[PDB]
Design an enzyme around this catalytic site. Structure first.
Site, mmCIF file in Angstrom:
data_model
loop_
_atom_site.group_PDB
_atom_site.id
_atom_site.type_symbol
_atom_site.label_atom_id
_atom_site.label_comp_id
_atom_site.label_asym_id
_atom_site.label_seq_id
_atom_site.Cartn_x
_atom_site.Cartn_y
_atom_site.Cartn_z
ATOM 1 N N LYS A 13 -56.332 16.152 -7.508
ATOM 2 C CA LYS A 13 -57.495 15.366 -8.017
ATOM 3 C C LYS A 13 -57.171 14.410 -9.169
ATOM 4 C CE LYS A 13 -60.513 18.682 -8.909
ATOM 5 N NZ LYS A 13 -60.038 20.004 -8.479
ATOM 6 N N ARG A 88 -68.801 22.023 -8.443
ATOM 7 C CA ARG A 88 -67.928 23.125 -7.977
ATOM 8 C C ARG A 88 -68.749 24.224 -7.365
ATOM 9 N NH1 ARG A 88 -62.278 23.513 -10.388
ATOM 10 N NH2 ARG A 88 -62.442 21.592 -11.662
ATOM 11 N N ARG A 127 -45.916 22.320 -12.626
ATOM 12 C CA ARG A 127 -46.617 21.281 -13.355
ATOM 13 C C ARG A 127 -46.357 21.235 -14.853
ATOM 14 N NH1 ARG A 127 -53.058 22.275 -13.928
ATOM 15 N NH2 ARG A 127 -53.510 20.143 -13.252
ATOM 16 N N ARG A 160 -50.024 24.177 -18.840
ATOM 17 C CA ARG A 160 -51.380 24.672 -19.050
ATOM 18 C C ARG A 160 -51.395 26.197 -18.949
ATOM 19 N NH1 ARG A 160 -55.793 21.337 -15.646
ATOM 20 N NH2 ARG A 160 -56.439 23.475 -15.098
ATOM 21 N N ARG A 171 -58.221 31.602 -10.071
ATOM 22 C CA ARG A 171 -58.775 30.290 -9.832
ATOM 23 C C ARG A 171 -58.984 29.995 -8.358
ATOM 24 N NH1 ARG A 171 -55.896 25.166 -12.156
ATOM 25 N NH2 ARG A 171 -54.206 26.485 -12.897
HETATM 26 N N1 AP5 Z 1 -49.243 14.674 -3.245
HETATM 27 C C1 AP5 Z 1 -48.590 15.482 -4.097
HETATM 28 N N2 AP5 Z 1 -47.381 15.993 -3.706
HETATM 29 C C2 AP5 Z 1 -46.631 16.814 -4.533
HETATM 30 N N3 AP5 Z 1 -47.112 17.101 -5.787
HETATM 31 C C3 AP5 Z 1 -48.299 16.591 -6.194
HETATM 32 C C4 AP5 Z 1 -49.093 15.816 -5.375
HETATM 33 N N4 AP5 Z 1 -50.227 15.488 -6.077
HETATM 34 C C5 AP5 Z 1 -50.176 16.073 -7.302
HETATM 35 N N5 AP5 Z 1 -48.966 16.744 -7.389
HETATM 36 C C6 AP5 Z 1 -48.450 17.628 -8.485
HETATM 37 O O1 AP5 Z 1 -49.184 18.848 -8.337
HETATM 38 C C7 AP5 Z 1 -49.630 19.381 -9.561
HETATM 39 C C8 AP5 Z 1 -51.173 19.421 -9.589
HETATM 40 O O2 AP5 Z 1 -51.660 18.067 -9.507
HETATM 41 P P1 AP5 Z 1 -52.949 17.587 -10.342
HETATM 42 O O3 AP5 Z 1 -53.335 16.229 -9.925
HETATM 43 O O4 AP5 Z 1 -52.790 17.807 -11.797
HETATM 44 O O5 AP5 Z 1 -53.999 18.593 -9.661
HETATM 45 P P2 AP5 Z 1 -55.578 18.803 -9.883
HETATM 46 O O6 AP5 Z 1 -56.086 18.960 -8.481
HETATM 47 O O7 AP5 Z 1 -56.248 17.746 -10.684
HETATM 48 O O8 AP5 Z 1 -55.574 20.344 -10.355
HETATM 49 P P3 AP5 Z 1 -56.139 21.066 -11.653
HETATM 50 O O9 AP5 Z 1 -55.389 22.309 -11.820
HETATM 51 O O10 AP5 Z 1 -56.053 20.198 -12.877
HETATM 52 O O11 AP5 Z 1 -57.599 21.302 -11.106
HETATM 53 P P4 AP5 Z 1 -58.691 22.249 -11.754
HETATM 54 O O12 AP5 Z 1 -59.969 21.930 -10.996
HETATM 55 O O13 AP5 Z 1 -58.136 23.645 -11.604
HETATM 56 O O14 AP5 Z 1 -58.787 21.829 -13.285
HETATM 57 P P5 AP5 Z 1 -59.942 21.212 -14.229
HETATM 58 O O15 AP5 Z 1 -59.245 20.621 -15.391
HETATM 59 O O16 AP5 Z 1 -60.929 20.352 -13.500
HETATM 60 O O17 AP5 Z 1 -60.770 22.514 -14.704
HETATM 61 C C9 AP5 Z 1 -60.177 23.530 -15.474
HETATM 62 C C10 AP5 Z 1 -61.198 24.631 -15.750
HETATM 63 O O18 AP5 Z 1 -62.346 24.085 -16.403
HETATM 64 C C11 AP5 Z 1 -63.534 24.737 -15.916
HETATM 65 N N6 AP5 Z 1 -64.350 23.776 -15.117
HETATM 66 C C12 AP5 Z 1 -64.040 22.445 -14.839
HETATM 67 N N7 AP5 Z 1 -65.050 21.893 -14.115
HETATM 68 C C13 AP5 Z 1 -66.008 22.857 -13.902
HETATM 69 C C14 AP5 Z 1 -67.237 22.859 -13.202
HETATM 70 N N8 AP5 Z 1 -67.720 21.794 -12.533
HETATM 71 N N9 AP5 Z 1 -67.970 24.027 -13.159
HETATM 72 C C15 AP5 Z 1 -67.528 25.167 -13.816
HETATM 73 N N10 AP5 Z 1 -66.301 25.178 -14.476
HETATM 74 C C16 AP5 Z 1 -65.570 24.025 -14.539
HETATM 75 C C17 AP5 Z 1 -63.042 25.903 -15.078
HETATM 76 O O19 AP5 Z 1 -62.758 26.978 -15.971
HETATM 77 C C18 AP5 Z 1 -61.764 25.320 -14.519
HETATM 78 O O20 AP5 Z 1 -60.931 26.311 -13.957
HETATM 79 C C19 AP5 Z 1 -49.079 18.437 -10.627
HETATM 80 O O21 AP5 Z 1 -47.886 18.979 -11.137
HETATM 81 C C20 AP5 Z 1 -48.775 17.156 -9.884
HETATM 82 O O22 AP5 Z 1 -47.725 16.408 -10.456
#
Ligand code: AP5
Ligand code: ZN
Length: 215
Positions: A13, A88, A127, A160, A171
Protein backbone atom coordinates in the site's frame (compact mmCIF):
# COMPACT_ATOMS: atom_id res chain seq x y z
CA UNK A 1 -10.38 11.01 -7.89
CA UNK A 2 -11.35 9.38 -4.60
CA UNK A 3 -9.36 6.20 -4.06
CA UNK A 4 -9.02 3.57 -1.33
CA UNK A 5 -6.00 1.25 -1.02
CA UNK A 6 -6.90 -1.92 0.83
CA UNK A 7 -4.60 -4.88 1.42
CA UNK A 8 -3.26 -7.13 4.15
CA UNK A 9 -0.14 -6.04 6.15
CA UNK A 10 2.81 -6.05 3.72
CA UNK A 11 0.72 -5.97 0.52
CA UNK A 12 2.50 -2.82 -0.79
CA UNK A 13 0.00 0.00 0.00
CA UNK A 14 2.61 2.64 1.02
CA UNK A 15 4.94 1.68 -1.83
CA UNK A 16 2.11 2.08 -4.37
CA UNK A 17 0.86 5.26 -2.68
CA UNK A 18 4.31 6.86 -3.28
CA UNK A 19 3.84 6.05 -7.07
CA UNK A 20 0.22 7.23 -7.18
CA UNK A 21 0.77 10.62 -5.52
CA UNK A 22 3.80 11.32 -7.67
CA UNK A 23 1.64 11.02 -10.83
CA UNK A 24 -1.68 12.39 -9.57
CA UNK A 25 -1.07 14.84 -6.75
CA UNK A 26 -4.03 13.98 -4.54
CA UNK A 27 -3.29 13.96 -0.80
CA UNK A 28 -2.14 10.72 0.81
CA UNK A 29 -4.28 10.06 3.86
CA UNK A 30 -2.96 7.15 5.97
CA UNK A 31 -4.57 6.21 9.33
CA UNK A 32 -1.24 4.56 10.37
CA UNK A 33 0.57 7.86 9.66
CA UNK A 34 -2.11 9.85 11.51
CA UNK A 35 -1.73 7.62 14.57
CA UNK A 36 2.06 7.85 14.37
CA UNK A 37 1.82 11.70 14.23
CA UNK A 38 -0.55 11.74 17.25
CA UNK A 39 2.09 9.59 19.04
CA UNK A 40 5.00 11.96 18.10
CA UNK A 41 2.78 14.85 19.35
CA UNK A 42 2.09 12.97 22.62
CA UNK A 43 -1.72 13.38 22.54
CA UNK A 44 -4.12 11.25 24.67
CA UNK A 45 -5.56 9.63 21.52
CA UNK A 46 -2.04 8.83 20.21
CA UNK A 47 -0.90 7.33 23.49
CA UNK A 48 -4.07 5.25 23.64
CA UNK A 49 -3.63 4.01 20.04
CA UNK A 50 0.04 3.04 20.58
CA UNK A 51 -0.66 -0.10 22.65
CA UNK A 52 -2.95 -1.51 19.91
CA UNK A 53 -0.48 -0.77 17.11
CA UNK A 54 2.51 -2.29 18.98
CA UNK A 55 0.52 -5.49 19.47
CA UNK A 56 -0.65 -5.63 15.83
CA UNK A 57 -4.28 -5.11 16.98
CA UNK A 58 -6.77 -2.81 15.25
CA UNK A 59 -7.40 0.51 16.96
CA UNK A 60 -11.14 0.63 17.89
CA UNK A 61 -13.48 2.00 15.19
CA UNK A 62 -14.86 4.96 17.14
CA UNK A 63 -11.55 6.81 17.56
CA UNK A 64 -10.38 5.93 14.04
CA UNK A 65 -13.59 7.04 12.34
CA UNK A 66 -13.44 10.40 14.22
CA UNK A 67 -9.93 11.23 13.03
CA UNK A 68 -10.66 10.29 9.41
CA UNK A 69 -13.90 12.28 9.47
CA UNK A 70 -11.96 15.40 10.63
CA UNK A 71 -9.08 14.90 8.11
CA UNK A 72 -11.25 14.32 5.06
CA UNK A 73 -13.42 17.39 5.78
CA UNK A 74 -10.39 19.66 5.14
CA UNK A 75 -10.22 21.83 2.01
CA UNK A 76 -7.28 19.83 0.56
CA UNK A 77 -9.39 16.65 0.27
CA UNK A 78 -12.13 18.19 -1.86
CA UNK A 79 -10.47 17.67 -5.27
CA UNK A 80 -9.50 14.02 -4.65
CA UNK A 81 -7.69 11.88 -2.09
CA UNK A 82 -5.83 8.57 -1.60
CA UNK A 83 -6.97 6.73 1.52
CA UNK A 84 -4.44 4.09 2.64
CA UNK A 85 -5.34 1.53 5.36
CA UNK A 86 -8.85 2.98 5.96
CA UNK A 87 -11.47 1.47 6.05
CA UNK A 88 -10.32 -1.81 7.70
CA UNK A 89 -13.70 -2.75 9.07
CA UNK A 90 -17.35 -2.70 7.73
CA UNK A 91 -18.22 -0.17 10.48
CA UNK A 92 -15.45 2.06 9.11
CA UNK A 93 -16.69 1.53 5.51
CA UNK A 94 -20.26 2.38 6.61
CA UNK A 95 -19.08 5.56 8.32
CA UNK A 96 -16.94 6.63 5.35
CA UNK A 97 -19.89 6.16 3.05
CA UNK A 98 -22.03 8.55 5.21
CA UNK A 99 -19.18 11.04 5.59
CA UNK A 100 -18.61 11.09 1.80
CA UNK A 101 -22.33 11.61 1.10
CA UNK A 102 -22.34 14.58 3.52
CA UNK A 103 -19.38 16.08 1.58
CA UNK A 104 -21.23 15.52 -1.76
CA UNK A 105 -18.58 12.90 -2.73
CA UNK A 106 -18.21 9.23 -3.57
CA UNK A 107 -15.40 6.69 -4.04
CA UNK A 108 -14.08 5.99 -7.59
CA UNK A 109 -12.18 2.79 -6.78
CA UNK A 110 -11.28 0.55 -3.87
CA UNK A 111 -8.06 -1.14 -4.92
CA UNK A 112 -7.69 -4.51 -3.22
CA UNK A 113 -3.95 -5.28 -3.50
CA UNK A 114 -3.70 -9.11 -3.41
CA UNK A 115 -0.56 -10.95 -2.21
CA UNK A 116 0.04 -14.55 -0.94
CA UNK A 117 0.64 -14.96 2.85
CA UNK A 118 4.17 -16.35 2.51
CA UNK A 119 5.16 -13.33 0.41
CA UNK A 120 3.59 -10.95 2.96
CA UNK A 121 5.77 -12.47 5.72
CA UNK A 122 8.94 -12.35 3.53
CA UNK A 123 8.17 -8.65 2.81
CA UNK A 124 7.60 -7.60 6.45
CA UNK A 125 10.66 -9.57 7.66
CA UNK A 126 13.04 -7.67 5.32
CA UNK A 127 11.50 -4.24 5.61
CA UNK A 128 13.42 -1.05 6.64
CA UNK A 129 11.77 2.37 6.87
CA UNK A 130 13.10 5.94 6.85
CA UNK A 131 12.65 7.53 10.32
CA UNK A 132 12.35 10.94 8.59
CA UNK A 133 10.13 10.51 5.53
CA UNK A 134 8.63 7.06 5.96
CA UNK A 135 9.86 5.68 2.60
CA UNK A 136 10.07 1.88 2.80
CA UNK A 137 12.80 -0.48 1.51
CA UNK A 138 13.40 -4.22 1.55
CA UNK A 139 16.80 -5.83 2.11
CA UNK A 140 16.26 -8.18 -0.83
CA UNK A 141 13.39 -6.92 -2.96
CA UNK A 142 13.96 -3.09 -2.87
CA UNK A 143 17.20 -2.16 -1.15
CA UNK A 144 18.45 1.39 -0.50
CA UNK A 145 21.53 2.47 -2.51
CA UNK A 146 23.63 2.36 0.69
CA UNK A 147 22.62 0.06 3.55
CA UNK A 148 20.93 1.91 6.48
CA UNK A 149 20.46 5.24 4.58
CA UNK A 150 17.28 6.60 2.95
CA UNK A 151 17.93 7.34 -0.80
CA UNK A 152 15.80 10.49 -0.71
CA UNK A 153 17.18 12.53 2.19
CA UNK A 154 20.04 10.66 3.90
CA UNK A 155 17.77 9.64 6.84
CA UNK A 156 18.28 6.68 9.20
CA UNK A 157 16.39 3.44 8.42
CA UNK A 158 14.64 1.58 11.26
CA UNK A 159 12.61 -1.67 11.72
CA UNK A 160 8.99 -1.26 12.78
CA UNK A 161 8.26 -2.96 16.14
CA UNK A 162 5.09 -4.58 14.76
CA UNK A 163 7.15 -6.29 11.98
CA UNK A 164 8.34 -9.02 14.42
CA UNK A 165 7.03 -12.45 13.27
CA UNK A 166 4.73 -13.00 16.30
CA UNK A 167 3.19 -9.58 15.83
CA UNK A 168 2.86 -10.10 12.04
CA UNK A 169 0.93 -13.30 12.74
CA UNK A 170 -1.51 -11.31 14.94
CA UNK A 171 -1.84 -8.58 12.27
CA UNK A 172 -2.67 -11.08 9.51
CA UNK A 173 -5.12 -12.90 11.83
CA UNK A 174 -6.95 -9.74 12.82
CA UNK A 175 -6.96 -8.15 9.36
CA UNK A 176 -7.89 -11.34 7.44
CA UNK A 177 -11.03 -11.68 9.60
CA UNK A 178 -12.13 -8.34 8.08
CA UNK A 179 -11.30 -9.01 4.40
CA UNK A 180 -14.40 -10.88 3.23
CA UNK A 181 -16.87 -8.49 5.02
CA UNK A 182 -15.09 -5.53 3.40
CA UNK A 183 -15.02 -7.20 -0.06
CA UNK A 184 -18.75 -7.99 0.21
CA UNK A 185 -19.50 -4.36 1.25
CA UNK A 186 -17.74 -2.96 -1.86
CA UNK A 187 -18.56 -5.68 -4.44
CA UNK A 188 -22.12 -4.48 -4.02
CA UNK A 189 -21.09 -0.83 -4.54
CA UNK A 190 -19.45 -1.58 -7.92
CA UNK A 191 -16.10 0.13 -6.95
CA UNK A 192 -13.90 -2.87 -6.03
CA UNK A 193 -10.97 -3.77 -8.27
CA UNK A 194 -8.50 -6.54 -7.37
CA UNK A 195 -4.86 -5.79 -8.14
CA UNK A 196 -2.22 -8.49 -8.40
CA UNK A 197 0.26 -7.10 -5.89
CA UNK A 198 2.70 -9.96 -6.45
CA UNK A 199 4.79 -8.40 -9.23
CA UNK A 200 7.70 -6.02 -9.54
CA UNK A 201 6.83 -2.68 -7.89
CA UNK A 202 6.61 -0.85 -11.24
CA UNK A 203 4.44 -3.55 -12.81
CA UNK A 204 1.88 -3.48 -9.98
CA UNK A 205 1.75 0.27 -10.73
CA UNK A 206 1.18 -0.42 -14.44
CA UNK A 207 -2.08 -2.13 -13.41
CA UNK A 208 -3.12 0.54 -10.93
CA UNK A 209 -2.26 3.35 -13.38
CA UNK A 210 -4.35 1.75 -16.11
CA UNK A 211 -7.39 2.28 -13.81
CA UNK A 212 -6.50 5.72 -12.43
CA UNK A 213 -5.46 7.17 -15.82
CA UNK A 214 -8.91 6.40 -17.23
CA UNK A 215 -10.60 8.63 -14.64
N1 AP5 B 1 5.83 -5.40 -5.31
C1 AP5 B 1 6.68 -5.62 -4.29
N2 AP5 B 1 7.60 -6.63 -4.42
C2 AP5 B 1 8.53 -6.91 -3.44
N3 AP5 B 1 8.54 -6.13 -2.30
C3 AP5 B 1 7.65 -5.11 -2.17
C4 AP5 B 1 6.68 -4.85 -3.11
N4 AP5 B 1 5.93 -3.79 -2.66
C5 AP5 B 1 6.39 -3.41 -1.43
N5 AP5 B 1 7.48 -4.22 -1.13
C6 AP5 B 1 8.29 -4.29 0.12
O1 AP5 B 1 7.45 -4.97 1.06
C7 AP5 B 1 7.46 -4.39 2.34
C8 AP5 B 1 6.04 -3.88 2.70
O2 AP5 B 1 5.69 -2.84 1.76
P1 AP5 B 1 4.87 -1.54 2.22
O3 AP5 B 1 4.48 -0.75 1.04
O4 AP5 B 1 5.55 -0.80 3.31
O5 AP5 B 1 3.55 -2.31 2.72
P2 AP5 B 1 2.16 -1.78 3.33
O6 AP5 B 1 1.15 -2.63 2.63
O7 AP5 B 1 1.95 -0.32 3.23
O8 AP5 B 1 2.21 -2.53 4.76
P3 AP5 B 1 2.12 -1.99 6.25
O9 AP5 B 1 2.76 -2.98 7.11
O10 AP5 B 1 2.74 -0.63 6.41
O11 AP5 B 1 0.54 -2.01 6.36
P4 AP5 B 1 -0.30 -1.87 7.69
O12 AP5 B 1 -1.74 -1.72 7.22
O13 AP5 B 1 0.03 -3.11 8.49
O14 AP5 B 1 0.23 -0.56 8.42
P5 AP5 B 1 -0.41 0.86 8.82
O15 AP5 B 1 0.73 1.78 9.02
O16 AP5 B 1 -1.52 1.31 7.92
O17 AP5 B 1 -1.11 0.56 10.25
C9 AP5 B 1 -0.36 0.16 11.37
C10 AP5 B 1 -1.30 -0.06 12.56
O18 AP5 B 1 -2.05 1.12 12.82
C11 AP5 B 1 -3.39 0.76 13.21
N6 AP5 B 1 -4.36 1.17 12.15
C12 AP5 B 1 -4.06 1.79 10.94
N7 AP5 B 1 -5.22 2.04 10.27
C13 AP5 B 1 -6.27 1.57 11.02
C14 AP5 B 1 -7.66 1.53 10.81
N8 AP5 B 1 -8.27 1.98 9.70
N9 AP5 B 1 -8.46 0.95 11.78
C15 AP5 B 1 -7.91 0.45 12.95
N10 AP5 B 1 -6.53 0.45 13.14
C16 AP5 B 1 -5.73 1.04 12.20
C17 AP5 B 1 -3.37 -0.75 13.41
O19 AP5 B 1 -2.86 -1.00 14.72
C18 AP5 B 1 -2.35 -1.14 12.36
O20 AP5 B 1 -1.89 -2.46 12.54
C19 AP5 B 1 8.46 -3.24 2.25
O21 AP5 B 1 9.70 -3.68 2.74
C20 AP5 B 1 8.57 -2.95 0.77
O22 AP5 B 1 9.82 -2.42 0.39
ZN1 ZN C 1 13.71 9.30 3.85
Amino acid sequence: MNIVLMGLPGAGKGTQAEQIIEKYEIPHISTGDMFRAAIKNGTELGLKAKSFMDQGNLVPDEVTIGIVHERLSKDDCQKGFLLDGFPRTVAQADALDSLLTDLGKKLDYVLNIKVEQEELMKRLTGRWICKTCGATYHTIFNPPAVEGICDKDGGELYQRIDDKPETVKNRLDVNMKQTQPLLDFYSQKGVLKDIDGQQDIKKVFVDINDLLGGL
